Design a protein around this ligand. Structure first.
Ligand SMILES: Cc1ccc(CNc2cc(Cl)nc(N)n2)cc1
Ligand SMILES: Cc1ccc(CNc2cc(Cl)nc(N)n2)cc1
Lengths: 208, 208
């Protein structure tokens, strides 16, 4: 069921930088994950213009934010294009390599962590607040998969057997013990309002 | 040879807003067109990861900025994914409709013109400085096309017979008489430095 993979060494060191650097403006994680969901939703939307059947796995284009204090998770759910297995294992890592290097150059040169999205690697900002990230995803062409990593240089992929999700991606943030402020309705709302206010898809912030 | 099309009424009114509103910070046009080229280059790059032959029409992934004082044009050239005929005539217009409406709502509500890129319609910022825009583009699946518009509610498309470009998109800005500062090497460099400094593709600013 479970395959284990090594991050390429550059992503590994980016993840450790994110995890070990002292940086108090952690909230930008949420903007990066939302902006990712928006791009994925733009992508399936555009694709559907030439192949309307690509929306057979779900017509609604949206983003949901789901805090769970019991599990201490914040989940970002979209009905975007999703990721194939090849994306999870390979394509996105290839992509992340030059973005990482550029970002890592920019930082030595005085850029700061909040600029991570400009380098195509904003997903890894999840590790500002999350000790473990689980990503469930479903692309029209492929099976539903669960990717997961607590950093430390590796990650897993397995075919997923929880609730079928139709199409999209769900990012589950297992929050660090000191980052539970991001389970709070008021804190989430404050962040979405500040950083994500012009996203062209409804964002629903679920309550508990 | 030449087909003439009407903009949908919402894009028409956006273009007139861009053309008639008093707004002195015109330089952001260049950031929007560069950011467009970057996304198009990300797109062909990603596609090539699963189909390396998509790079048979050119391996180099780059952006060139070409001022021409004699013709009074500034051209932004990329070797990105390019646009099919259906994109030019249809797909991009469909896309632009909700971005426009959202942007136009945001403006009534106090947002300003520089935020146009957040709504997916930054291309039309070209009309801050250009009395006419000509776009030459070539997608792997299709022929080379020339799109063109001086606004006033319509646009043309024709198959293009100038130099074959292999793959990509060239945006030719016929500048308004009072906007020739954007032909100046120093002004362009100043703008790219300010707004476009972390683009992950070489940007070459040609001199005359
Ligand atoms: C480098 C890198 C870029 C992007 C990711 C995650 N990307 C995605 C991809 C999709 Cl289809 N949907 C969402 N929400 N996120 C992971 C790594
Ligand atoms: C709404 C709207 C969005 C985008 C455009 C132009 N888009 C593109 C498309 C491509 Cl493939 N390359 C570049 N450089 N620009 C035109 C209109």
């Amino acid at each position: 069921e479970v395959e284990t993979f090594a991050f390429q060494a550059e992503i590994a060191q980016l993840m450790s930088l994110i995890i070990n650097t002292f940086y108090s403006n952690k909230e930008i994680f949420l903007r990066e994950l939302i902006s990712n969901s928006s791009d994925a939703l733009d992508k399936i939307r555009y694709e559907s213009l030439t192949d309307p059947s690509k929306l057979d796995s779900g017509k609604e284009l949206h983003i949901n934010l789901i805090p769970n204090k019991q599990d201490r998770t914040l989940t970002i759910v979209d009905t975007g294009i999703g990721m194939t297995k090849a994306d999870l294992i390979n394509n996105l890592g290839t992509i992340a390599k030059s973005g990482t290097k550029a970002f890592m150059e920019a930082l030595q040169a005085g850029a700061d962590i909040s600029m991570i999205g400009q380098f195509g690697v904003g997903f890894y900002s999840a590790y500002l607040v999350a000790e473990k990230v689980t990503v469930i995803t479903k692309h029209n062409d492929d099976e539903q998969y669960a990717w997961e990593s607590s950093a430390g240089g590796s990650f897993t992929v397995r075919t997923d057997t929880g609730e079928p999700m139709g199409r999209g991606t769900k990012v589950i943030l297992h929050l660090k013990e000191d980052q539970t402020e991001y389970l709070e309705e008021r804190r989430i709302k404050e962040i979405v309002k500040k950083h994500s206010q012009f996203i062209g898809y409804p964002i629903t912030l679920f309550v508990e």
